[PDB]
């Protein structure tokens, strides 16, 4: 079997979409763009 979660960091910056962990207020802002915008799936009419 496998066990031993030792992947902690306590980063100050975190994504509001997944909760990632960054170090600067820039790298996190860029990773966000990835969230806002995905393949053409689910026509959300408006
Ligand atoms: Zn994210």
Contacting residues for 10 by C-beta, under 8 A, at least 6 apart: 21
Where does residue 10 fall: left (phi above 0), alpha (psi -120 to 50 degrees), or beta otherwise?
left
Pairwise CA distance, residues 29 & 10, whole Å: 18
Pairwise CA distance, residues 14 & 28, whole Å: 7
Distance 24 CA to ligand 1 centre (A): 14
Buried b (16+ CB within 10 A) or exposed e, 17-31: eeeeebeeeeebeee
Distance 30 CA to ligand 1 centre (A): 10
Structure-determination technique: NMR
Fold category of 11-46 in CATH: Double Stranded RNA Binding Domain (3.30.160)
């Amino acid at each position: 079997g496998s066990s031993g979660s030792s992947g902690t960091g306590e980063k100050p910056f975190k994504c509001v979409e997944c909760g990632k962990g960054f170090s600067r207020r820039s790298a996190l802002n860029v990773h966000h763009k990835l969230h806002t915008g995905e393949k053409p799936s689910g026509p959300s009419s408006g």
